[PDB]
Amino acid sequence: DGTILAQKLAEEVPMDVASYLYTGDSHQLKRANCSGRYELAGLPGKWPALASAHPSLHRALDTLTHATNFLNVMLQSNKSREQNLQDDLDWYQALVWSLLEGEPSISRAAITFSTAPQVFLQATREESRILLQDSHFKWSPPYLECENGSYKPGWLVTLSSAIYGLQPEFRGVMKVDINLQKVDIDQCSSDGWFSGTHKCHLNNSECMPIKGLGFVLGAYECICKAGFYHPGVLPVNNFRRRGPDQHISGSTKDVSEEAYVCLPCREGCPFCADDSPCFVQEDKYLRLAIISFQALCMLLDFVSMLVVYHFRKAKSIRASGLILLETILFGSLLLYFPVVILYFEPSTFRCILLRWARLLGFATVYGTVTLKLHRVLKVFLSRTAQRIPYMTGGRVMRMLAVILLVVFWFLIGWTSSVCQNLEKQISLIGQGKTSDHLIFNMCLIDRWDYMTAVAEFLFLLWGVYLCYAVRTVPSAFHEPRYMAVAVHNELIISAIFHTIRFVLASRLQSDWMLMLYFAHTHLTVTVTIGLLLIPKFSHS
Amino acid sequence: DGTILAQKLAEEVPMDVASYLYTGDSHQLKRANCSGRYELAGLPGKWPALASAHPSLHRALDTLTHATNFLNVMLQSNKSREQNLQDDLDWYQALVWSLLEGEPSISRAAITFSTAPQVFLQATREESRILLQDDKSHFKWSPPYLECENGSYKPGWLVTLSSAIYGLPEFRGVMKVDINLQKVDIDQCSSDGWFSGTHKCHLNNSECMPIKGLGFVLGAYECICKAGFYHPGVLPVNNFRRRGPDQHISGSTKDVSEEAYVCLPCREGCPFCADDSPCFVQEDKYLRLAIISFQALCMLLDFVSMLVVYHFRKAKSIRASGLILLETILFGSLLLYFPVVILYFEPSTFRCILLRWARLLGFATVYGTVTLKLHRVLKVFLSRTAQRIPYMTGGRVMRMLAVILLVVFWFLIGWTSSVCQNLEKQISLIGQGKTSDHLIFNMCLIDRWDYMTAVAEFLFLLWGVYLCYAVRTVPSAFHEPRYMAVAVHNELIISAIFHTIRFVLASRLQSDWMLMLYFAHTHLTVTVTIGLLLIPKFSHS
Ligand SMILES: CCCCCCCC/C=C/CCCCCCCC(=O)OC[C@H](COP(=O)(O)OCCN)OC(=O)CCCCCCC/C=C/CCCCCCCC
Ligand SMILES: CC(C)CCC[C@@H](C)[C@@H]1CC[C@H]2[C@@H]3CC=C4C[C@@H](O)CC[C@]4(C)[C@H]3CC[C@@]21C
Ligand SMILES: CC(C)CCC[C@@H](C)[C@H]1CC[C@H]2[C@@H]3CC=C4C[C@@H](O)CC[C@]4(C)[C@H]3CC[C@]12C
Ligand SMILES: CC(C)CCC[C@@H](C)[C@H]1CC[C@H]2[C@@H]3CC=C4C[C@@H](O)CC[C@]4(C)[C@H]3CC[C@]12C
Ligand SMILES: CC(C)CCC[C@@H](C)[C@H]1CC[C@H]2[C@@H]3CC=C4C[C@@H](O)CC[C@]4(C)[C@H]3CC[C@]12C
Ligand SMILES: CC(C)CCC[C@@H](C)[C@H]1CC[C@H]2[C@@H]3CC=C4C[C@@H](O)CC[C@]4(C)[C@H]3CC[C@]12C
Numbered sequence A: 001d002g003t004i005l006a007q008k009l010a011e012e013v014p015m016d017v018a019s020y021l022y023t024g025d026s027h028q029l030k031r032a033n034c035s036g037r038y039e040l041a042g043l044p045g046k047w048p049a050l051a052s053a054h055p056s057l058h059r060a061l062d063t064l065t066h067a068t069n070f071l072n073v074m075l076q077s078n079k080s081r082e083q084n085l086q087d088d089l090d091w092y093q094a095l096v097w098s099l100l101e102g103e104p105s106i107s108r109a110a111i112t113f114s115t116a117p118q119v120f121l122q123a124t125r126e127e128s129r130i131l132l133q134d135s136h137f138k139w140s141p142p143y144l145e146c147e148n149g150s151y152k153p154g155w156l157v158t159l160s161s162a163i164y165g166l167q168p169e170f171r172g173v174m175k176v177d178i179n180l181q182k183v184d185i186d187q188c189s190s191d192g193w194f195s196g197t198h199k200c201h202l203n204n205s206e207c208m209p210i211k212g213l214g215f216v217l218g219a220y221e222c223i224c225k226a227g228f229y230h231p232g233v234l235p236v237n238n239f240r241r242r243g244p245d246q247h248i249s250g251s252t253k254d255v256s257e258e259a260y261v262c263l264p265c266r267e268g269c270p271f272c273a274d275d276s277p278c279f280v281q282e283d284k285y286l287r288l289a290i291i292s293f294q295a296l297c298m299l300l301d302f303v304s305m306l307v308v309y310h311f312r313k314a315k316s317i318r319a320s321g322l323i324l325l326e327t328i329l330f331g332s333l334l335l336y337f338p339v340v341i342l343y344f345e346p347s348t349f350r351c352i353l354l355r356w357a358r359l360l361g362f363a364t365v366y367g368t369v370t371l372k373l374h375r376v377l378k379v380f381l382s383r384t385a386q387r388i389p390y391m392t393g394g395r396v397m398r399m400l401a402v403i404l405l406v407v408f409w410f411l412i413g414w415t416s417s418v419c420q421n422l423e424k425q426i427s428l429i430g431q432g433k434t435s436d437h438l439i440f441n442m443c444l445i446d447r448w449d450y451m452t453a454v455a456e457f458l459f460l461l462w463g464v465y466l467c468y469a470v471r472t473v474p475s476a477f478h479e480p481r482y483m484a485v486a487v488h489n490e491l492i493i494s495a496i497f498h499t500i501r502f503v504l505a506s507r508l509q510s511d512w513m514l515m516l517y518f519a520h521t522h523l524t525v526t527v528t529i530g531l532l533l534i535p536k537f538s539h540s
Numbered sequence B: 001d002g003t004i005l006a007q008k009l010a011e012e013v014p015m016d017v018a019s020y021l022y023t024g025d026s027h028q029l030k031r032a033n034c035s036g037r038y039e040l041a042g043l044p045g046k047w048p049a050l051a052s053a054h055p056s057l058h059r060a061l062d063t064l065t066h067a068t069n070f071l072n073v074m075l076q077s078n079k080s081r082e083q084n085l086q087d088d089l090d091w092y093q094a095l096v097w098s099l100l101e102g103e104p105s106i107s108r109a110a111i112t113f114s115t116a117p118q119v120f121l122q123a124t125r126e127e128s129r130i131l132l133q134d135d136k137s138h139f140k141w142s143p144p145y146l147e148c149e150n151g152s153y154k155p156g157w158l159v160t161l162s163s164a165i166y167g168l169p170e171f172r173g174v175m176k177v178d179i180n181l182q183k184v185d186i187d188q189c190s191s192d193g194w195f196s197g198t199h200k201c202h203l204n205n206s207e208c209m210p211i212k213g214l215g216f217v218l219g220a221y222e223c224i225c226k227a228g229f230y231h232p233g234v235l236p237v238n239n240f241r242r243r244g245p246d247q248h249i250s251g252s253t254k255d256v257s258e259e260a261y262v263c264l265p266c267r268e269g270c271p272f273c274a275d276d277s278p279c280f281v282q283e284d285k286y287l288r289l290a291i292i293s294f295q296a297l298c299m300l301l302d303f304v305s306m307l308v309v310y311h312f313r314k315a316k317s318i319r320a321s322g323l324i325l326l327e328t329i330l331f332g333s334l335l336l337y338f339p340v341v342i343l344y345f346e347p348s349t350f351r352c353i354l355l356r357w358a359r360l361l362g363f364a365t366v367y368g369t370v371t372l373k374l375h376r377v378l379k380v381f382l383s384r385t386a387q388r389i390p391y392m393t394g395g396r397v398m399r400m401l402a403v404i405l406l407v408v409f410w411f412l413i414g415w416t417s418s419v420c421q422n423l424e425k426q427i428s429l430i431g432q433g434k435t436s437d438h439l440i441f442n443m444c445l446i447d448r449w450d451y452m453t454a455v456a457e458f459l460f461l462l463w464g465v466y467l468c469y470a471v472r473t474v475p476s477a478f479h480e481p482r483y484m485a486v487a488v489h490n491e492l493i494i495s496a497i498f499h500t501i502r503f504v505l506a507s508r509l510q511s512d513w514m515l516m517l518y519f520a521h522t523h524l525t526v527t528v529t530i531g532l533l534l535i536p537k538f539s540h541s
């Protein structure tokens, strides 16, 4: 409301808004009336003595105070004839002369002393003569000399006092014309004189709510109407920075007197450009040819669960067993959620579940392959001695529950110990640095990933020794020959992947960490269920 | 040097020091030729430029200067000679009346007007009657003035602001204005502004600030210096020094009030005040040694028992139990006797980590082969019922413990490397807590993995409990699997009770009550375990 009142008053007084914008103005054109009786004056009503426009105003009021006090003293003096003789009238000239020779900026001052006017006046400071014509420190609005045309003066005020006489009041006043030209024109904020507390072009109405900490003022807000002087305060035009966000500085359009959008240069970073900087564009033509192929090989794996169920009466599946063949086949679905979870975005619950699907999908697929490969050695070796008929799931799914109890215990402890530092430090989401000064959101390794990448390497060495003990064991379907490739293959292309994933942990873009999780799970997982399932229906 | 200057001049101007600290000393003050003539206030400056003595000092000067400028007009006025008429004199009287009424603070103000002295003096503010009795410029200054007469009287200090009149060779006169400062505070006595500007603060600052870091000896008033003028709302904060925990704390020990000294006290290890006791828990060394003198005796007996068992290696009782399998239990139990020797020692960062390497490696060694020995007898009994006999002594049971040991080592290596990686962010190991009496003692904290490595023991001992249940009718000649039955349940119960007591009452137990717990727990489960698997071997053949 305060800003718009000045806008209306600009056209409420013609040919004066140019005088506000340019302090010269009258130097170029001068043909008008005695304009400028009062414009905005004191937007908060009026300032008695406040707003501290320099110390000139206060000291002028003070000198007027203890200069009219002088006449207020020679009021109750007895036997005061006051003949107004030649010497007596020269008494009154001295005070008016002294009223000018103690202040930096001051203009004509006059006294009525109506007993017969006996009005005395003087000219401006340091150059004034004498000319005779023929309450409680009231104030006056800005002014401009009415004489003829407009001239330079610059809205001089007419602060005046009153004189009371004894016998009512004297019908006399004391005029002081303060020169207000070379005076700082407020600061367009921080409530003072004629620019009251907002009084500019949209500090916060356009650029502040969206752009936190706008700082549109600096030292002079929206630099406003002005017109008095150009002091050393350095009017800060378009000082709003506010860092980034929707509203930046405003160096796009709407600049000079008419100044408004200041809304641009906002994309992810404290910069000013298009969406070239950080938050690199995620290619959508490559992320839709992977998740759509990761879910076509996932539903082609759930369909294969029904097929073996329908073929459970065959001579090739009865030997392996229906319960030890779908434990492998169901645990390979948990190995297909390195990519569906890494695709969306890094998060806290979305990065804890990454470790719950890799450690439980490994103890189920490769934790029972080495158990039915351990059976083959122990059955032949001990039946060469004769007895101990071994059994199917119930003595091998009972030895697997122990493996799934040590790994299920670690996950509970690790999850509980990782959702505790969140009150102090969150390491589940980090940031990276590229060559071209670009940053992406990833998951940070917490030194519990180099040790669960050795437990997978030490557990697969037990399946390597068993592949040598069954090297000369006759078999009907050569199954121990396909369970030996699937262990020597998982062992090799999983140590290489972890080494690449650990060394190049911060130099891999988020779009390049799903072309490595997609070439891993399709060279170790898809060739494991392609070796344990294909030589069961055909090629018997 | 500045602080000492006040005490040095205290004797240079006697009878006035009591008038400084006690502004009311004037009324008894009776005689003396006069009173104060001068104070050496030149240490900060000749007189304070931009003085902090209100705006009264800077605004009372305006009344005199703008009256001198009024008088600085007719010095050159034509025909302004006259003969000092009665009307001319009344205007000058009006001048001085205006000067007196221009400021409440301004006292008697006088003008000379030497042509005939024509010197005028009036009474004080708000009550003033006129009285008539018979170079350098630019507003010179004067030192504080004490009215002479007899004694010192109430008004006290009066600054005599003076100027000069240059009439057309000067005028041989001065403008006299006296300002009263009995309502003016003496700066702060520690900023830079009146008699004690950043000085005259005896027995403070360097006394308690370098050793007592962040001394804050001021607060809001350091060393209330002169007084004598007034006691405004500044509220002189004498002895306001706190300094937090420094070698010199506050200073409320001795040498209080005026004569100040001895500000050094209440400092040992803690931000408290009194003696060393409040932040030092009791440490009964006669009890803390009565535990090690007993707990270290059991270690020597355990080690001697190893040689004793080795000597009787051909005994019928030990041949049927396994010499290689019996030494491992003793060695593991020896390794379970280091949660107390490490605890007794004050909690370091190397020692508070080794406390978990000895408990975990000593549990999987003692209660990791009792269960295997109990399992092998069940396997032998089941197999021998119908046709082959398939287990043997150390070598088939001894190398089945290697898997458990490997898992334990893997977990220990994983945890050790993950706890000495957070030290860059948080030690999270050496914490502290109170005993409900604001007496704190350092100890170790819980890493939240200790909660998990206490159900693992509980879940592992359930296998041994089931094995104990399975074997209850097998013929045993030496009752070997009957003594191991009690040794599993006893530990399973007391270890769980001790663990839950330690976890619940974790931050409310003193250091000496933690030793009494770690020592009582290790003698009801560990000493009894080797009291059942060892004693019925040499005796009761
Ligand atoms: C809190 C402290 C308490 C200590 C408790 C720790 C318990 C940890 C281990 C739990 C029990 C694990 C199995 C132990 C039971 C008995 C061992 C055993 O006999 O297995 C030997 C078994 C064959 O036995 P046989 O009698 O010949 O065959 C009979 C078949 N009918 O052979 C093996 O299992 C060899 C084991 C090597 C496997 C590879 C392990 C390599 C290291 C991995 C460490 C990882 C630990 C877990 C971390 C998981 C991280 C996700
Ligand atoms: C999901 C988690 C919490 C529960 C796991 C507990 C149960 C389901 C575990 C996991 C797999 C289970 C086995 C799966 C299949 C069989 C074959 C059946 O002929 C007898 C029971 C038996 C041998 C189960 C015994 C219990 C078992 C070992
Ligand atoms: C992932 C971890 C925690 C648990 C693993 C779950 C496993 C053990 C469960 C999940 C689904 C289960 C299968 C569900 C249905 C059938 C058909 C039935 O005629 C034989 C058992 C069989 C084939 C189950 C075997 C065990 C099984 C594969
Ligand atoms: C793949 C299947 C078998 C996984 C089994 C479900 C697991 C992953 C679920 C069960 C309970 C879950 C947790 C429950 C609560 C929290 C606290 C929250 O502030 C962060 C996530 C976190 C820590 C969850 C992580 C995922 C979680 C551990
Ligand atoms: C995945 C985790 C949480 C489950 C762990 C629990 C497993 C190991 C438990 C639950 C129920 C248990 C079975 C319950 C009953 C019997 C019959 C008896 O002959 C003892 C062994 C046997 C066959 C147990 C073997 C272990 C067992 C399968
Ligand atoms: C297969 C599923 C059902 C079993 C998994 C159960 C485990 C993962 C659950 C059971 C209770 C859970 C805890 C319950 C409460 C809290 C407090 C919270 O501030 C942080 C997570 C934490 C510490 C949870 C961590 C995960 C947790 C330990």
Ligand SMILES: CC(C)CCC[C@@H](C)[C@H]1CC[C@H]2[C@@H]3CC=C4C[C@@H](O)CC[C@]4(C)[C@H]3CC[C@]12C
Residues within 6 Å of the ligand: A450, A453, A454, A457, A495, A498, A499, A502, A503
């Ligand atoms: C061989 C199989 C068991 C895989 C085991 C994983 C090993 C090789 C991994 C786990 C943690 C890895 C290290 C993690 C971080 C760094 C710092 C980097 O500036 C150089 C490589 C180096 C030093 C890695 C080397 C490879 C490493 C030691």
Ligand SMILES: CC(C)CCC[C@@H](C)[C@H]1CC[C@H]2[C@@H]3CC=C4C[C@@H](O)CC[C@]4(C)[C@H]3CC[C@]12C
Residues within 6 Å of the ligand: A458, A459, A461, A462, A465
């Ligand atoms: C890191 C150091 C201390 C451990 C080195 C040996 C560790 C890694 C263990 C883990 C599993 C172990 C293998 C697991 C299984 C067997 C079965 C047995 O038929 C002979 C030993 C053999 C073939 C092991 C030899 C070494 C081995 C790989």
Ligand SMILES: CC(C)CCC[C@@H](C)[C@H]1CC[C@H]2[C@@H]3CC=C4C[C@@H](O)CC[C@]4(C)[C@H]3CC[C@]12C
Residues within 6 Å of the ligand: A485, A489, A523, A527
């Ligand atoms: C391209 C590679 C790196 C991806 C992984 C596939 C590897 C592990 C698989 C795919 C096909 C497999 C081969 C298929 C058939 C045979 C014939 C058999 O008598 C010996 C093993 C051998 C020779 C296999 C070795 C392993 C093998 C080469």
Ligand SMILES: CC(C)CCC[C@@H](C)[C@H]1CC[C@H]2[C@@H]3CC=C4C[C@@H](O)CC[C@]4(C)[C@H]3CC[C@]12C
Residues within 6 Å of the ligand: A522, A523, A526, A527, A530, A531, A534, A535, A539
């Ligand atoms: C798609 C990417 C991940 C590669 C996957 C290739 C897999 C599915 C293919 C490539 C070569 C294939 C093998 C080639 C030869 C034979 C012999 C024949 O008796 C059928 C099974 C077997 C053993 C095949 C199993 C499946 C196999 C391993």
Ligand SMILES: CC(C)CCC[C@@H](C)[C@H]1CC[C@H]2[C@@H]3CC=C4C[C@@H](O)CC[C@]4(C)[C@H]3CC[C@]12C
Residues within 6 Å of the ligand: B323, B324, B327, B328, B331, B361, B365, B405
């Ligand atoms: C791995 C750590 C924590 C514990 C393992 C220590 C065990 C396995 C070692 C330590 C000292 C060893 C004993 C030292 C000396 C002898 C005497 C010899 O005539 C028979 C073997 C026997 C009795 C050893 C058996 C194994 C033993 C008990």
Ligand SMILES: CC(C)CCC[C@@H](C)[C@H]1CC[C@H]2[C@@H]3CC=C4C[C@@H](O)CC[C@]4(C)[C@H]3CC[C@]12C
Residues within 6 Å of the ligand: B394, B395, B396, B398, B399, B400, B401, B402
């Ligand atoms: C020395 C310490 C620090 C390392 C860990 C100790 C382990 C690895 C050692 C200590 C005693 C060793 C056993 C001592 C003797 C035998 C008998 C026979 O069956 C060969 C292996 C076997 C069973 C050893 C296996 C490894 C073993 C268990």
Ligand SMILES: CC(C)CCC[C@@H](C)[C@H]1CC[C@H]2[C@@H]3CC=C4C[C@@H](O)CC[C@]4(C)[C@H]3CC[C@]12C
Residues within 6 Å of the ligand: A447, A450, A454, B406, B409, B410, B411, B413, B417
């Ligand atoms: C064999 C089983 C029990 C565990 C083996 C652990 C030993 C051999 C090795 C394997 C991987 C290794 C870690 C790999 C990477 C790092 C990060 C480096 O900045 C400090 C050392 C540290 C933390 C290594 C410590 C030693 C370590 C844990």
Ligand SMILES: CC(C)CCC[C@@H](C)[C@H]1CC[C@H]2[C@@H]3CC=C4C[C@@H](O)CC[C@]4(C)[C@H]3CC[C@]12C
Residues within 6 Å of the ligand: B413, B416, B417, B420, B421
């Ligand atoms: C039984 C043997 C194999 C285990 C020996 C333990 C060794 C390998 C482990 C235990 C504690 C470990 C240290 C723990 C903490 C740190 C600080 C880290 O900033 C650098 C690595 C460093 C210095 C680790 C180095 C490896 C370390 C010394």
Ligand SMILES: CC(C)CCC[C@@H](C)[C@H]1CC[C@H]2[C@@H]3CC=C4C[C@@H](O)CC[C@]4(C)[C@H]3CC[C@]12C
Residues within 6 Å of the ligand: B472, B482, B485, B486, B487, B489, B490, B493
């Ligand atoms: C309060 C706490 C400490 C009680 C201690 C438990 C004691 C009293 C209990 C727990 C398990 C018990 C044993 C369990 C099984 C057997 C086998 C049986 O054929 C004779 C008794 C015997 C040997 C029991 C003796 C008493 C026993 C040792």
Ligand SMILES: CC(C)CCC[C@@H](C)[C@H]1CC[C@H]2[C@@H]3CC=C4C[C@@H](O)CC[C@]4(C)[C@H]3CC[C@]12C
Residues within 6 Å of the ligand: B451, B454, B455, B458, B496, B499, B500, B503, B504, B505
């Ligand atoms: C019997 C076995 C489980 C012994 C180990 C006890 C573990 C598993 C559990 C059982 C009950 C648990 C306590 C139950 C309640 C509380 C109060 C809470 O404000 C802090 C944790 C604390 C103190 C728990 C700490 C862990 C605790 C002691």
Ligand SMILES: CC(C)CCC[C@@H](C)[C@H]1CC[C@H]2[C@@H]3CC=C4C[C@@H](O)CC[C@]4(C)[C@H]3CC[C@]12C
Residues within 6 Å of the ligand: B523, B524, B527, B528, B531, B532, B535, B536, B540
């Ligand atoms: C010192 C405190 C903790 C008390 C514990 C002392 C232990 C060592 C004592 C208390 C009771 C004792 C048992 C009491 C009776 C017998 C029966 C005897 O035929 C063989 C020894 C045996 C089995 C003792 C072994 C040692 C024993 C367990």
Ligand SMILES: CC(C)CCC[C@@H](C)[C@H]1CC[C@H]2[C@H]3CC=C4C[C@@H](O)CC[C@]4(C)[C@H]3CC[C@]12C
Residues within 6 Å of the ligand: A481, A484, A485, A488, A489, A492, A493
């Ligand atoms: C990772 C790169 C090198 C490709 C992976 C190829 C590896 C894993 C494959 C290719 C050929 C494979 C076979 C080579 C030799 C034999 C002997 C044969 O009687 C059974 C299969 C077995 C034991 C395979 C082991 C794994 C093997 C070496």
Ligand SMILES: CC(C)CCC[C@@H](C)[C@H]1CC[C@H]2[C@H]3CC=C4C[C@@H](O)CC[C@]4(C)[C@H]3CC[C@]12C
Residues within 6 Å of the ligand: B399, B400, B402, B403, B405, B406, B409
């Ligand atoms: C940390 C310690 C245990 C490391 C010692 C390394 C070597 C000596 C140990 C560690 C693990 C051990 C075992 C690995 C695998 C098996 C198969 C198991 O059915 C009987 C013991 C046996 C045959 C052990 C052989 C020796 C072994 C490889």
